[PDB]
Amino acid sequence: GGYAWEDEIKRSWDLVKVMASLVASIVEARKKRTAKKNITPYQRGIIRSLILTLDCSEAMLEKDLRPNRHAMIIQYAIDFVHEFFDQNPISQMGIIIMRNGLAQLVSQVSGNPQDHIDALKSIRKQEPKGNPSLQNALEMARGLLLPVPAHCTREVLIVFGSLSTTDPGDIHQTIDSLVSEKIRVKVLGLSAQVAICKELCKATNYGDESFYKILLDETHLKELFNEAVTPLPVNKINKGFTLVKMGFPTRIFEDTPTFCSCHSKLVYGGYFCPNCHSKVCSLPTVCPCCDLMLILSTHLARSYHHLMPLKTFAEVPTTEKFRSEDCFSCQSRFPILKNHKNGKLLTSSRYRCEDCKQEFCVDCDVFIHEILHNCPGCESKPV
Amino acid sequence: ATLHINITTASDEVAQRELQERQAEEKRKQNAVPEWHKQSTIGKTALGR
Amino acid sequence: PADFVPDSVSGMFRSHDFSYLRLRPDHASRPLWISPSDGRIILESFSPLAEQAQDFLVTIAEPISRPSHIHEYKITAYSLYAAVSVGLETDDIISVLDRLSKVPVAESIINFIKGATISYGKVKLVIKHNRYFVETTQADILQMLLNDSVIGPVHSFEIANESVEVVKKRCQEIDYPVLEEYDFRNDHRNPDLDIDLKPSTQIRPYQEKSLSKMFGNGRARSGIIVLPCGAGKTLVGITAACTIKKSVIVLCTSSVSVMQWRQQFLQWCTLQPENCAVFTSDNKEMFQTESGLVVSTYSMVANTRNRSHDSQKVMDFLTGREWGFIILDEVHVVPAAMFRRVVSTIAAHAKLGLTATLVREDDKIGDLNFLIGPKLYEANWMELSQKGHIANVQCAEVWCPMTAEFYQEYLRETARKRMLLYIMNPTKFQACQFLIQYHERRGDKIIVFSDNVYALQEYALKMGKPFIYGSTPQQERMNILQNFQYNDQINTIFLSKVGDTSIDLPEATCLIQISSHYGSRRQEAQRLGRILRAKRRNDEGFNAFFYSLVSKDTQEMYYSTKRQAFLVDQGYAFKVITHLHGMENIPNLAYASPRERRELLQEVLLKNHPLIRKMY
Amino acid sequence: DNIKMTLQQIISRYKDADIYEEKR
Amino acid sequence: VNVNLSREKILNIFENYPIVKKAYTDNVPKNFKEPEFWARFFSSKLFRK
Ligand SMILES: [Zn+2]
Ligand SMILES: [Zn+2]
Ligand SMILES: [Zn+2]
Ligand SMILES: [Zn+2]
């Protein structure tokens, strides 16, 4: 009975109370790899047309993301554009921002990533203000994704930072129109689960509720943006399996500069189009003279790895006889990892491929499944 | 007591933001550290008349 | 020693080669280093479990220094007394000290801890109807106290009131220290009070930590709490008065501080004015209730001169009434000549010492432990400054070179004339004028302190700014103060030593210290606390300005280096400024001509029967 | 006081009106 | 005291409140001009209601 601070010393020094120690670290990675066990080659739409919608409201001035939401979302959008056109070269992209209740187009739908980089850098200087509008952004996204062909999957990505939206009309009609035009919308919210974004993601993705993503921290935003560059799997009901007529241009080498057909400027190099013999500056792109796509073989090969993803490497049991004491790809010394003599041999770091029965370490388990896309044991096997 | 209104024909908003950033920059200038505080003055000549 | 051969590099360590202590293998989580030479403790603030050792060391030890990275503490007997008084046994402290330190604790340190902690709480001081008694739980301890027999006619005996400090000192010399704790929960002779804090008032958590250090065991323990000026040192005394709920008296250094403390008791705590009385020259009424508040200055109670009959009656009432608690604001004047008796003529169980300057030039400051008690709480000034509680002062020192004739005259005269000679250097005039011109354009409110009154008058004549000294009219002083506070064309006020003391001054952000009363560490913090309560503390990027103008190659350097010792021990960094950008293109040049400098120099040298009544 | 307050208000409105007309 | 009125705010006032547009139609082209009408509206009981 009395005041709080006159009761007793808080005794903060005494609250802290104090070999198989690696097992607790191993089981966390095992639970992480458990979610990635099931994998099969889903059909994915390679040719993409993405409309990136960025929120630029007063709600983007919140200090909970160092330094402010607007600048760091723009920086990760620059990184997203670079990764998206690195891994999906033959795709197209437009950038729309939400500002003052208005949808503002900052880059037309084009395959050149440097234009989008310049547009995002131009946005980064200005300050965000206003009250965002999902319906205006979705209507301009619908307008931008009207002229793209039927073989190209139409996708809209929204980085929606606010919690409330103000619309000039009924947003359910806009959702119905987006569903009727086969436009898929994935929304990366910043604060909480808004109802209209969840309903939009559920309706435009054929009932899948997993396309509304809410982050946790700084690294989870990188995780979400890195997940977003992979093409979305298409549904079985879609029958737009369409041939695309394109040409493979030839890189010309001339010591005299010439007028390009796309920008009408002096360029020393260029790619002669195989159909109309006109030259283009960048690749891959539609030809300005004949409306024919010009890509390289590496532009197909970059997205070819989504077609047949490699099956995940399974960690071998410790009781099994080891095929090799060294890695197949790098001959890393596989650690015996003997915690103690009574602890015996536990959590051997050998990872086996199913198709070739070869053992790899955790380094090659990381590299063969993210950067490389072919198991060296599978191509070393004389099939 | 008196009531005064300002009518802007959607063109002078950038002017008011220019004013706002101008009091912002003069406030940051008047709250800035002096040159002798952020930089050491021992490398230059001594003070005098 | 632990059988370790000295090294070749170890020959230059004067008995401080402590490499015989074997490093523990799990030392990455242990943030303490123990030196067996004097019990000095080294703490790191970046390792894991840093705060668990930090709060423990600030409870069991005093801080030598607290910089940002590595803190340095001292183990002393009094901090151990404060730690064991709040319920910390020896074995737990020793065990967690071995746990939290990389090096093992030596035998000498453990023996010192055991010797200091034991025989504590044996002798205790009690007051029974304004009569001091010493009591011991063991009978023989009264018999070993057989040297200083000042006994005047469970195991308790009476001590004369005027010689109680000698008893405290002689018990400190022996290993049986004195203990003073007010058990106000079990005290029923003194009438209780219904004093409480207002629900609309908030208490900032470091004040709660200081009160918890004062009231760790649930009883009022006498001691000294030091806080920065303007950071709420009065609120701690207000909360302590609301806590003990007994008869509380407050002693201040000035009558303006007395009326400020009466304002404190009227506004931040629920005290009706009939419980509050003022004992000053103008105000002498005394409360008719059985228990209340009286606020006064040390000067009346400690006066050895002939006092008036009303003041004699008030003093006799203060002597005859048993007080339960006393607030000693600005405790640094307590160890002086007559103020040392203010705890002897007034009988109080709990003694609180509140100040901002716990430093004096003489050693008698170290006698406060014999007057008030153990040092309770030391405030971390960086922690308060980085949280916006006090302004971030930029301690700078502007160096002023000498002219040849002035410094030649400086080398040929005595020190008293030398002081006025190095204050009146024209280089300091130019530097002060440039600083005023620079800080007036920024909208900063400037207070310029200089103790020499002739220097103050010369500065006021040369620059054209108002000046305040001791013998100035008081209405003129208030007029200058509101002209500083409200009128914007006066932003620089020149003050003498009057502004150094605890008087009401308007808020300012810029201070220029021209001269000072020799090397006084108290005056630096007294002046710096004026700008610690600045209004712009909530503004981001605001930095208060504190410049100390010194005359180069003279005794200003020595005096300022001695003066800045307390401020750098608190943590402030005094950055040197030997060049100011603006001397070459200054509009107004003060004493630029050599003849004007010479004229100033000889001015300083010349300074030192009802009918016959109409006939006259 | 009432008549000077209402006449102040009406001349404030007229001052706003002719200031706007001078600007436009 | 000063209040700023953008033309977008005027359009929002007209759209959200038909009474203000109704007064604007028969007051502004007839008797008194636009800023006088807005000052009278802001000094009226209708703005409080
Ligand atoms: Zn072509
Ligand atoms: Zn081009
Ligand atoms: Zn490997
Ligand atoms: Zn394989």
Assigned token pair, C192? 């209780």
Please, which residues 3-22 of chain D have a Cβ atom closer than 8 Å to chain B?
Answer: 5, 8-9, 12-13, 16, 20
Instruction: For residues C126 and C350, give the distance between their C-alpha atoms in angstroms, rounded to a whole number.
Output: 10
| Phi, psi (deg, nearest 5) at residue C419 | -60, -50
- Report the DSSP pairing between strands A48-55 and A153-160: parallel
Q: Which of A160, A157, A185 is nearest to A80 (CA)?
A: A157
Instruction: For residues C20 and C7, give the distance between their C-alpha atoms in angstroms, rounded to a whole number.
Output: 11
Assigned token pair, C592? 């630029």
CA of A283 to the centre of ligand 1 (A): 13
Which ligand ends up closest to the CA of A334? 3
Q: End-to-end alpha-carbon separation of chain E, Å?
A: 21
CA of D4 to the centre of ligand 1 (A): 81
Instruction: For residues A304 and C451, give the distance between their C-alpha atoms in angstroms, rounded to a whole number.
Output: 85
Cis peptide before A67 (omega within 30 of 0): yes
C126 with C256: CB under 8 angstroms?
no
Check the CA dihedral C93-C99-C100-C103 and report its sign: positive
CB pairs under 8 A between B and C: 55
DSSP code, position C614: G
Q: What strands lie across the sheet with A359-360, from one edge to the other?
A: A314-315, A351-352, A359-360
**Of B28, B35, B49, Cβ closest to residue C581:** B35
A282 with A112: CB under 8 angstroms?
yes
What chain A residue is nearest to C208 in terms of C-alpha separation?
Answer: A5
**Cβ contacts of C564 within 8 Å, gap of 6 or more:** C395, C397, C524, C548, C572, C574
Angle at C79 between CA C73 and CA C85, to 5 degrees: 145
Assigned token pair, E34? 């636009």
Assigned token pair, C171? 């018990």
The number of CA neighbours under 13 Å toward the Cβ of E6 is 9
Contact B2 E1 (CB under 8 A): yes
DSSP code, position C163: G
Q: End-to-end alpha-carbon separation of chain D, Å?
A: 34
**Residues of C comprising the binding site for ATP?**
227-234
Burial bucket for residue E10 (CB in 10 Å: 0-12, 13-18, 19+): middle
Contact B36 C579 (CB under 8 A): yes
Instruction: For residues C303 and C300, give the distance between their C-alpha atoms in angstroms, rounded to a whole number.
Output: 5
Q: Which chain A residues have a beta carbon less than 8 Å from that of C53?
A: 13
Contact C577 B35 (CB under 8 A): no
Check the CA dihedral C78-C81-C85-C86 and report its sign: positive
Instruction: For residues C250 and C257, give the distance between their C-alpha atoms in angstroms, rounded to a whole number.
Output: 10
> How distant, in Å, are the alpha carbons of A178, C517, E20, E22, E40 from that of E46?
43, 70, 9, 13, 10
Contact C401 B31 (CB under 8 A): no
Contact C243 A9 (CB under 8 A): no
- CA distance to partner chain D, nearest, from residue E18 (Å): 24
Q: Which of C180, C51, C154, C61 is nearest to C113 (CA)?
A: C61
What chain D residue is nearest to E32 in terms of C-alpha separation?
Answer: D17
CB pairs under 8 A between D and E: 19
SS3 label, residue C116: helix
Amino acid at D21: E
| Phi, psi (deg, nearest 5) at residue E25 | -65, -40
Q: Residue C47 CA to chain centroid, in angstroms?
A: 32
Amino acid at A96: I
Beta bridge partners of B5: E3
Angle at C275 between CA C271 and CA C278, to 5 degrees: 105
- CA distance to partner chain D, nearest, from residue B9 (Å): 11
Cis peptide before A284 (omega within 30 of 0): yes
CA of A146 to the centre of ligand 2 (A): 25
Give the total residue count for chain C. 616
C272 with C289: CB under 8 angstroms?
no
Burial bucket for residue C460 (CB in 10 Å: 0-12, 13-18, 19+): middle
Q: Which of C1, C40, C53 is nearest to C22 (CA)?
A: C1
SS3 label, residue C386: helix
Instruction: For residues C513 and C492, give the distance between their C-alpha atoms in angstroms, rounded to a whole number.
Output: 12
CA of C271 to the centre of ligand 1 (A): 93
- CA distance to partner chain D, nearest, from residue B21 (Å): 25
Q: To 10 degrees, what angle do helices D2-23 and E34-42 make? A: 150
Assigned token pair, A85? 């056109």
The subunits that touch chain E, with at least 3 C-beta pairs less than 8 Å apart, are B, D
- Residue-by-residue DSSP string for C202-248: ---HHHHHHHHHHTTTSSEE-EEEE--TTSSHHHHHHHHHHHH-S-E
- Largest alpha-carbon pair distance within chain B? 59
Burial bucket for residue A356 (CB in 10 Å: 0-12, 13-18, 19+): middle
Instruction: For residues D23 and E33, give the distance between their C-alpha atoms in angstroms, rounded to a whole number.
Output: 14
Counting CB pairs under 8 A, whether chains D and A reach 3 or more, is: no
C354 with C236: CB under 8 angstroms?
yes
Using the structure block, give the residue that is written with the tokens 């020259």: C281
- Report the DSSP pairing between strands A183-189 and A279-280: unpaired
**Of B2, B4, B10, Cβ closest to residue E6:** B10
